[PDB]
Amino acid sequence: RSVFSERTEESSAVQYFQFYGYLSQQQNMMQDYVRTGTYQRAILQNHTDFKDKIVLDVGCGSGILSFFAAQAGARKIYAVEASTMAQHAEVLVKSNNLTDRIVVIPGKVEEVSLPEQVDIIISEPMGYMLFNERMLESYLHAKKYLKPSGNMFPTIGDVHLAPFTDEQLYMEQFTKANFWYQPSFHGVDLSALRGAAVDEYFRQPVVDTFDIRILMAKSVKYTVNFLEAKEGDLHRIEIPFKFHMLHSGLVHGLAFWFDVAFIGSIMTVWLSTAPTEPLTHWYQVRCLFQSPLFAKAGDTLSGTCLLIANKRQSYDISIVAQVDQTGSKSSNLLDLKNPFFRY
Amino acid sequence: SVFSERTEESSAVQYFQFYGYLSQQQNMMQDYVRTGTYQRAILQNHTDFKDKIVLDVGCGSGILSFFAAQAGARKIYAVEASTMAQHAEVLVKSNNLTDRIVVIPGKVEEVSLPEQVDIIISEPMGYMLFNERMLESYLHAKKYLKPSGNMFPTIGDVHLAPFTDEQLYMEQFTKANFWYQPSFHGVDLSALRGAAVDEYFRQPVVDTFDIRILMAKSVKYTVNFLEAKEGDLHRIEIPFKFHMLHSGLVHGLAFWFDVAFIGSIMTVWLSTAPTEPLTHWYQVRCLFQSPLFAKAGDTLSGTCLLIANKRQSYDISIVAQVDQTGSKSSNLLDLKNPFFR
Amino acid sequence: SVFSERTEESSAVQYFQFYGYLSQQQNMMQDYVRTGTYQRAILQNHTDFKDKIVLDVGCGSGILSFFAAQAGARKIYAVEASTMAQHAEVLVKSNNLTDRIVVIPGKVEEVSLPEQVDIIISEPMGYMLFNERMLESYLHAKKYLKPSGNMFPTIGDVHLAPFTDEQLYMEQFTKANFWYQPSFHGVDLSALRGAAVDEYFRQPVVDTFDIRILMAKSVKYTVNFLEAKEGDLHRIEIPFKFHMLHSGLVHGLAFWFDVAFIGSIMTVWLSTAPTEPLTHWYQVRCLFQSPLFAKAGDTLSGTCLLIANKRQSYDISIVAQVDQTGSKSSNLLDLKNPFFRYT
Amino acid sequence: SVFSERTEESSAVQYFQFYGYLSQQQNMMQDYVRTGTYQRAILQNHTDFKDKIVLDVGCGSGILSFFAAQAGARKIYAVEASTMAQHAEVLVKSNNLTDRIVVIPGKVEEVSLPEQVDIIISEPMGYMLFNERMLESYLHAKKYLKPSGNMFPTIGDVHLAPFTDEQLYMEQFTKANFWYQPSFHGVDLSALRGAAVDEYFRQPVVDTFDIRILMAKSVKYTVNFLEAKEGDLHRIEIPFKFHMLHSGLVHGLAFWFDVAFIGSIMTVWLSTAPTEPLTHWYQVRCLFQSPLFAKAGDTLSGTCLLIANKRQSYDISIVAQVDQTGSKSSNLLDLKNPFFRYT
Ligand SMILES: COCn1cc(CN(CC[C@@H](N)C(=O)O)C[C@H]2O[C@@H](n3cnc4c(N)ncnc43)[C@H](O)[C@@H]2O)c(N)nc1=O
Ligand SMILES: COCn1cc(CN(CC[C@@H](N)C(=O)O)C[C@H]2O[C@@H](n3cnc4c(N)ncnc43)[C@H](O)[C@@H]2O)c(N)nc1=O
Ligand SMILES: Nc1ncnc2c1ncn2[C@@H]1O[C@H](CSCC[C@H]([NH3+])C(=O)O)[C@@H](O)[C@H]1O
Ligand SMILES: Nc1ncnc2c1ncn2[C@@H]1O[C@H](CSCC[C@H]([NH3+])C(=O)O)[C@@H](O)[C@H]1O
């Protein structure tokens, strides 16, 4: 089998590539000006990294990044795409008179064969919390086509996590779960399922944005170097943390966001999804605790955020956190595949 | 005596100690709606007092007896069980009414009066009207009432109505979920979560609210003090059938009460409804542990059962259902330990 | 099984995961019209349930089976294919009804019932009535129905009506014209504008509307669940002849549906019509690619052909013409991927 | 028993009913300073608990016994007189510590413990430290303490200090002057004005205040729980001689208290001082009937005599004089019925 199939449930792959086969979704990604513009800036301002070079675009979709590479003077670009969007990319390559420079290769990057090794790999494989969709693994897998001296755009990825307080959000989810608390819904006693319901709602990472004032400690950083990492490194991601609490209050969970860096020869360009930066279509992600932890300012909040890759192109998240001064511990399970889009 | 038989000593001690404080008397006296309405009911029905023999059940500072004196009563027996009776006597003397107000120290169930009275005055209303169980003392005092004599107040109406207030609900649920946490300073409290919910939701909420939270016109339960007997208040069964005017979550039942002084010249009402100026009685709300969903036009039916206990209060049982769907709620409350919000 | 042959693995997995969530069951349960009307239909026809054998096809949380129990059913077989079946089992135990409700995990096409039933209950309706193809499971279950048996619901009416909505129509070109720009970050996107238009118009629109946009009395197509077979729903041909009540441009066809519970005591209706309180089904509108002009009194005639596909949905083919002018329009829609427009 | 001999039954009923409420236990438990400092004192002195026999006097919810268990205690006898004992028993079971914690329902003066203990833990402090008279139970429990055994807390300090607060003083007369009107609804109430003043001044005021109202360093009275007998708390005579730091009118005495946990590893202090974060004990102020003028450098001397009564509280007798001027004032207060002024 291919590396993709061996790690991916068929149902998930079918659904996944059907999602990206729609022009409306491509439009949605393209209209994220921060993203699209920052990519174009990272590529054009490092034009020497592309000038007369061989390029691989992993998961090119409509092909916009391959066009940026073409603008930067790349002589040959292999644009790999597994969804049917590949046909639409071909249309744009012809209508933009770039048939001699951009070559669409339909299929999964783990299964196609490229005619030659490339000087640089470009891609946008970041999902929610950076790791959702497991496309970073495809990105890393594609390094089998990278020359020894090769480069990756983006080059590194930073995941930031920080504790937050937000009673409204907490109560908003708790209210949804308490439906299953009723002893007589149309005469039916549902309460025996309330535990299972709370679990289910709190299993949902919350995707949306927020005021930075809800953050109770400076973030902890976890970095993935795309030039150095291997695929298998992402099957199990262990992020330890030790927060020094800047404010007193209830910690309702952990907030996540990510930065990527295009480390080019001319300059390094950053693409950030932090809540201190303009909103992107990645927003930010929050994992709620079923029971918040009370912490005093100056306390230490320690524990681990554990990501286990599953066959549905996503991760099982286990977060365990503890207030060191009191031993108050919280353990939580989340399913990154199924988030709650709150925005 | 009837009083001691139905009352635990500990409760009685705490109860009469409470009313022995001048500050509390000041509190009741500075409720202007209450005091003014009482004075109005007595003075505008002055003929019901003119040259009459009066009994004041639980006179406290004696203010109602002074109102009776202002209206021309010939002799007023002011019975008071707390030490406040001493202070009432001081005021009787300093107001030169020794010939018209006679203070009787002791419980109305135990003291001896020299004669029968033409009219009984008292202010025995508690939270939900019935808290403190003083209405029974008031009814008990009718053994001193001449056959056609009168009662001030004459009747009392308890009003019930369903309400929606998720803020209140979640405010209490938040308090109970403290006992939900699996690691408080490392200790798992969750096994007590149920007991915590029960305790918190047993508490009637005393406070006021905007009338728009009411989802149906109130149902009325009436006690006629002229006809009622003491024993009638031992077990109070209030059936209700609400016709829902609004759709939404019913979080519980709101209670308040009116009393009427049905005098010969006019009927004067004293009201604690949320549509009227606030009194020191406020209003009382009983929460359901789980709210009931109802659409407008539905009927909410059930029973409110009040059982008198030896702690001078009531055990409250509320059973309610949305008839159209069978959605049912049952709740037990302890009027003894309310939440003053 | 009959189910597996008519359903792609990929679609079935996503489908039963969807219904495995308590929140989704809750969403259906909190539709008061839906749930209350089912309860009302069952309880007010208690003679159809008193001491009877009942089958609940796709019981979900088990709510309809509890309604059957409230009506006095002797035995209810509650069949459920998703993982919700266990939660249903929990509720049966905690409601002390284990001696009357038997939860059978699995597809109704694959499980075996120990005996024949007197009545079948189910809520198999999707958008436009037919979406999700669960009506076929409902009909398939009649192999367990006594010759005497009844179906709750008994019949289903799909209503079609022509509408005018200039804003909805123009919205499609407004969204698609994103691609009609010669230099999006230096890329000429215009060659995909046509494909983007096609994509938007293939989407049935889910939401509600003011009834004044309807330009003719609806045409009705009826399925009698007592008489129909599974195969009858593989190819559904709905001819129509609308007599225009208003003059104007016809932008497409609006769809909604009613079902009726024809019991021994009374008939109870559940309607999702735009004249009734909103339900979670809303209404569905299929646009014409080219609007048709009609004067009041003119006739709009044609056909709506629904062809079942293995993605548990239908390919919708609509052809319409104004008989007085001969001016014609078409459209092909994919009911599996509707556009949820409601806000 | 010793308890009944010193306690009126009505008061005892009221007292244990109060602590039978989960809300009251929660009130004490959510005091982070109190609870955190107990936990800290116990855990940081783990050698005082490891494999030891512990007695928890008035365990309430059992929170301190769990701390003793966290510190490695071999066996903990948790004695509790109210109905909270059953709830503590539940938590012991649900926290799997039935082999380490034994809940004993009943009064510590009445129950039978099987063996002597190495250390006694308790939180028996009331307002002004001594209110509720539970410290005597704590000391009484030493009949179960091995010689050389320890007490947590080990000592208790009550602090007294003179204060100025013109607002607080005038307030008593503002409230009592309600009665000083010749026609309240036609009634001359003035004859009760003196009695009203007396009543207000007998009430110790419970609430907090700005430390700038304090006019001299506090005088400290220390009870060593390892050395003291219960009978030592029946008549507590606190002489004082304040060296005035500020000039002005002294309106009364402010009270607060500290306890110290003197362990083998370290001493941990729990303070309810007005210089520390607020606790549920707040502080207590007792007024003089007549304020005393004092110049900075003067000495204010006298006595605070606390006399235990059968209502689980004290009659407070304060006599004070400005030594340089001979100006004298006194007050007699009823600690059982304090005025909760805090807002
Ligand atoms: C929705 O929110 C934004 N977003 C975007 C992306 C990236 N996108 C699209 C980017 C691309 N269209 C462009 O324009 O750069 C993924 C694209 O890559 C394709 N793809 C994925 N795994 C593949 C594989 N093994 N082999 C070949 N192609 C593969 C897939 O079909 C898409 O066309 C993401 N990872 N998470 C997100 O949340
Ligand atoms: C929370 O709100 C306050 N509140 C106030 C009152 C009224 N007050 C004073 C009434 C009168 N002094 C006036 O001034 O109106 C009651 C007075 O009645 C006395 N009393 C009670 N049972 C007695 C008995 N068997 N024998 C003799 N005296 C008895 C008791 O000692 C008080 O002094 C009330 N009934 N319900 C309330 O809720
Ligand atoms: N062929 C099938 N066999 C068994 N269950 C099915 C089948 N097709 C759909 N279902 C289930 O049928 C349910 C339809 S949703 C209706 C749920 C529930 N009866 C209620 O009235 O609230 C979903 O829970 C599906 O998982
Ligand atoms: N003589 C006594 N014997 C047993 N328990 C008592 C006695 N006097 C008071 N108590 C209880 O002691 C507790 C004091 S409150 C402290 C509770 C708990 N140890 C904590 O630290 O949170 C209350 O639960 C009282 O009921």
Q: Is A329's CB within 8 Å of B186's CB?
A: yes
- Give me the residue from A23, A95, A201 closest to C23, CB to CB: A201
- Give me the residue from C63, C186, C187 closest to A92, CB to CB: C187
The label of the residue with tokens 């007490």 reads D151
Alpha helix stretches (DSSP H) within A113-267: 135-141, 167-177, 194-202
Q: Is residue C183 located within the same domain as residue C166?
A: yes
Structural tokens at position C265? 């005591």
Of the candidates D68, A327, D92, A326, which has an alpha carbon nearest to the alpha carbon of residue B192? D92
The three-state DSSP-derived secondary structure of chain B is CHHHHCCCHHHHHHHHHHCCCHHHHHHHHCCHHHHHHHHHHHHCCHHHCCCCEEEEECCCCCHHHHHHHHCCCCEEEEEECCCHHHHHHHHHHHCCCCCCEEEEECCCCCCCCCCCEEEEEECCCECCECCCCHHHHHHHHHHHEEEEEEEECCEEEEEEEEECCHHHHHHHHHHHHHHHCCCECCECCHHHHHHHHHHHHCCCEEECCCHHHECCCCEEEEEECCCCCHHHHCEEEEEEEEECCCCEEEEEEEEEEEEEEECCCCEEEEECCCCCCCCCCCEEEEEEEEEEEECCCCEEEEEEEEEEECCCEEEEEEEEEECCCCEEEEEEEECCCCEEC
The label of the residue with tokens 């026809």 reads C45
CATH assignment at residue A128: 3.40.50.150
Structural tokens at position A138? 């495809």
Query: What SS3 state is found at D229?
Result: coil
Query: What SS3 state is found at A199?
Result: helix
One DSSP character per residue, C301-327 reads EEEEEEEEETTTEEEEEEEEEETTT--
Q: Is residue B143 located within the same domain as residue B176?
A: no
For residue C156, CA distances in Å to C124, C270, D115 come to 11, 9, 79
Strands B53-57 and A340-341: unpaired
Say whether B283 counts as a known binding-site residue: no
Residue C39: nearest ligand to its CA? 3
Amino acid at A168: Q
User: Partners of D339 in the beta sheet?
Assistant: D205
Count of Cβ atoms closer than 10 Å to residue A316 Cβ: 16
User: Partners of A81 in the beta sheet?
Assistant: A106
**Sequence-ordered list of residues with C-beta below 8 angstroms from that of D46, at least 6 positions apart, any chain:** D71, D72, D265
- Is C13 touching A (CB cutoff 8 A)? yes
Measured CA to CA, the distance from residue B130 to residue C288 in angstroms comes to 70
Measured CA to CA, the distance from residue D74 to residue D94 in angstroms comes to 18
Q: Determine which helix (DSSP H) or strand (DSSP E) holds D168, and give its type and residue range.
A: helix D166-176
Residue-range definition of the domain harbouring residue C112: 1-153
Direct distance between the N- and C-terminal alpha carbons of chain C, in angstroms, rounded to an integer:
40
**Sequence-ordered list of residues with C-beta below 8 angstroms from that of B147, at least 6 positions apart, any chain:** none
Torsion sign across C-alpha atoms D161, D166, D172, D175: negative
CA atoms within 13 A on the CB side of B192: 32
Measured CA to CA, the distance from residue D92 to residue D65 in angstroms comes to 9
Q: Is residue B134 located within the same domain as residue B270?
A: no
Measured CA to CA, the distance from residue D117 to residue D102 in angstroms comes to 13
Measured CA to CA, the distance from residue B326 to residue B320 in angstroms comes to 10
Structural tokens at position A150? 């090769």
Of the candidates A334, A292, A19, A90, which has an alpha carbon nearest to the alpha carbon of residue A207? A334
**Sequence-ordered list of residues with C-beta below 8 angstroms from that of A270, at least 6 positions apart, any chain:** A38, A259, A260, A261, A262
Q: Is residue D176 located within the same domain as residue D266?
A: yes
Measured CA to CA, the distance from residue C66 to residue C57 in angstroms comes to 13
Tell me which chain C residues have a C-beta less than 8 angstroms from the C-beta of A27: 175, 178-179, 196
Amino acid at A316: D
Nearest CA in chain A to D70: A327
Atom 37 of ligand 2: nearest residue by CA position: B126
- Nearest 10 degrees: Cα torsion B85, B89, B94, B95: 90
For residue D101, CA distances in Å to A6, A34, C19, D119, D146 come to 53, 60, 46, 14, 19
Q: Is B94's CB within 8 Å of D188's CB?
A: yes
Torsion sign across C-alpha atoms C183, C185, C189, C195: negative
Q: Is residue B83 located within the same domain as residue B179?
A: no
**Sequence-ordered list of residues with C-beta below 8 angstroms from that of B261, at least 6 positions apart, any chain:** B41, B42, B45, B152, B153, B154, B267, B268, B269, B270
Torsion angles phi and psi, residue C125, rounded to 5: -85, 130
Residue after which a domain boundary falls, among D125, D153, D181: D153
CA atoms within 13 A on the CB side of D208: 14
Instruction: Confirm if A176 and A204 have CB atoms less than 8 A apart.
Output: no
- Is A168 touching B (CB cutoff 8 A)? no
- How many domains does chain D divide into? 2
Find the farthest-apart pair of alpha carbons in chain D and give their distance in angstroms, rounded.
74
Residues of A with a known catalytic role: 32, 124, 133, 281
The label of the residue with tokens 């549920």 reads D280
CA of D343 to the centre of ligand 2 (A): 28
User: Partners of B309 in the beta sheet?
Assistant: B313
Of the candidates C293, C308, C279, C283, which has an alpha carbon nearest to the alpha carbon of residue C133? C308
Atom 37 of ligand 1: nearest residue by CA position: A127
Measured CA to CA, the distance from residue C300 to residue C290 in angstroms comes to 14
CB distance A61 to ligand 1 below 6 Å: yes
Q: Is B325's CB within 8 Å of C36's CB?
A: yes
Count of Cβ atoms closer than 10 Å to residue D51 Cβ: 10
Amino acid at A219: S
- Nearest 10 degrees: Cα torsion B46, B49, B51, B56: -150
**Sequence-ordered list of residues with C-beta below 8 angstroms from that of D151, at least 6 positions apart, any chain:** D119, D120, D138, D142, D145, D225, D226
Torsion sign across C-alpha atoms D25, D27, D29, D34: negative
Q: Is residue B108 located within the same domain as residue B228?
A: no
- Is B206 touching D (CB cutoff 8 A)? no
A95 by Cβ neighbours in 10 Å (0-12 / 13-18 / 19+) ranks as middle
From D37, D57, D77, D87, give the residue whose CB has the most ligand 4 atoms within 8 Å, as the site to mutate.
D57
Residue B24, min C-alpha distance to chain A (Å): 39
Strands B313-322 and D328-334: unpaired
Query: What SS3 state is found at C197?
Result: helix
**Sequence-ordered list of residues with C-beta below 8 angstroms from that of C191, at least 6 positions apart, any chain:** A91, A92, A94, A95
The alpha carbons of chain B give a radius of gyration, in whole angstroms, of 22
Task: Find the length of chain A.
Answer: 343
Among A residues 306-325, those touching chain D with beta carbons less than 8 Å apart = 325
Amino acid at B310: K
Task: Find the length of chain C.
Answer: 343
Structural tokens at position B146? 């001449």
Residue after which a domain boundary falls, among C101, C125, C153: C153
Torsion sign across C-alpha atoms D322, D328, D333, D338: negative
One DSSP character per residue, C143-182 reads GGEEEEEEEES-EEEEEEEEE--HHHHHHHHHHHGGG--T
Instruction: Confirm if A143 and A117 have CB atoms less than 8 A apart.
Output: no
Count of Cβ atoms closer than 10 Å to residue A148 Cβ: 5
Measured CA to CA, the distance from residue B144 to residue C251 in angstroms comes to 87
CA of D111 to the centre of ligand 4 (A): 14
The technique by which this structure was obtained is X-ray
Count of Cβ atoms closer than 10 Å to residue D269 Cβ: 16
The label of the residue with tokens 């609509």 reads C318
**Left, alpha or beta for C173 (phi > 0: left; psi -120 to 50: alpha)?**
alpha
Measured CA to CA, the distance from residue C107 to residue A340 in angstroms comes to 29
CATH assignment at residue B177: 2.70.160.11
Task: Find the length of chain B.
Answer: 341
Amino acid at A304: T
Instruction: Confirm if C119 and C94 have CB atoms less than 8 A apart.
Output: no
**Sequence-ordered list of residues with C-beta below 8 angstroms from that of C227, at least 6 positions apart, any chain:** none
Direct distance between the N- and C-terminal alpha carbons of chain B, in angstroms, rounded to an integer:
36
CB distance D2 to ligand 4 below 6 Å: no
Amino acid at C129: L
Q: Is B329's CB within 8 Å of A291's CB?
A: no
Residue D259, min C-alpha distance to chain A (Å): 20
Tell me which chain A residues have a C-beta less than 8 angstroms from the C-beta of C177: none
Strands B155-163 and B219-224: antiparallel
Q: Is residue B122 located within the same domain as residue B235?
A: no
DSSP 8-state class, residue D69: H
CA of D18 to the centre of ligand 4 (A): 11
Q: Is residue A129 located within the same domain as residue A197?
A: no
Instruction: Confirm if D294 and D244 have CB atoms less than 8 A apart.
Output: yes
Structural tokens at position C222? 């009826």
Residues of B with a known catalytic role: 31, 123, 132, 280
- Give me the residue from A175, A182, A291 closest to B181, CB to CB: A291
Of the candidates A88, A15, A83, which has an alpha carbon nearest to the alpha carbon of residue C337? A15
In the sheet that holds A146-153, the strands lie side by side as A102-106, A76-81, A54-58, A118-123, A146-153
Instruction: Confirm if B204 and B160 have CB atoms less than 8 A apart.
Output: no
Tell me which chain A residues have a C-beta less than 8 angstroms from the C-beta of D70: 327
Atom 10 of ligand 2: nearest residue by CA position: B123
CB distance A62 to ligand 1 below 6 Å: yes
Measured CA to CA, the distance from residue C102 to residue A83 in angstroms comes to 44
Tell me which chain B residues have a C-beta less than 8 angstroms from the C-beta of D190: 94
Residue A74, min C-alpha distance to chain B (Å): 58
Q: Determine which helix (DSSP H) or strand (DSSP E) holds D102, and give its type and residue range.
A: strand D101-105
Strands B313-322 and B299-309: antiparallel
Q: What value, to the nearest 5°, has the Cα angle with vertex D177 and ends D173 and D183? A: 175
Torsion angles phi and psi, residue B110, rounded to 5: -125, -30
Q: Is residue C171 located within the same domain as residue C274?
A: yes
Residue B201, min C-alpha distance to chain A (Å): 15
Measured CA to CA, the distance from residue A129 to residue A339 in angstroms comes to 11
Measured CA to CA, the distance from residue A193 to residue A178 in angstroms comes to 10
Residue after which a domain boundary falls, among B153, B179, B204: B153
Torsion angles phi and psi, residue C338, rounded to 5: -80, 165
Measured CA to CA, the distance from residue B166 to residue A191 in angstroms comes to 19
One DSSP character per residue, C266-309 reads -EEEEE--TTS---TT-EEEEEEEEEEEE-TT-EEEEEEEEEEE
Of the candidates A13, A260, A252, A279, which has an alpha carbon nearest to the alpha carbon of residue A160? A260
Q: Is C187's CB within 8 Å of A11's CB?
A: no
Catalytic residue selected from C89, C118, C123, C230? C123
Documented resolution in Å: 2.3
For residue D246, CA distances in Å to A286, D105, D217, D250, D302 come to 55, 52, 10, 10, 18
Q: Is residue B286 located within the same domain as residue B160?
A: yes
Residue B8, min C-alpha distance to chain D (Å): 9
Q: Is residue A143 located within the same domain as residue A170?
A: no
- Is C32 touching B (CB cutoff 8 A)? yes
Query: What SS3 state is found at D331?
Result: strand
Query: What SS3 state is found at D172?
Result: helix
Measured CA to CA, the distance from residue D314 to residue D202 in angstroms comes to 12
Q: Which of C30, C32, C37 to mutate to test the interface with B (most CBs of B within 10 A)?
A: C32
Ligand 3 atom closest to Cα of residue C124: 14
The label of the residue with tokens 């204010």 reads D300
Q: Is C14's CB within 8 Å of A15's CB?
A: yes
Measured CA to CA, the distance from residue B195 to residue C255 in angstroms comes to 52
Q: Is residue B218 located within the same domain as residue B334?
A: yes
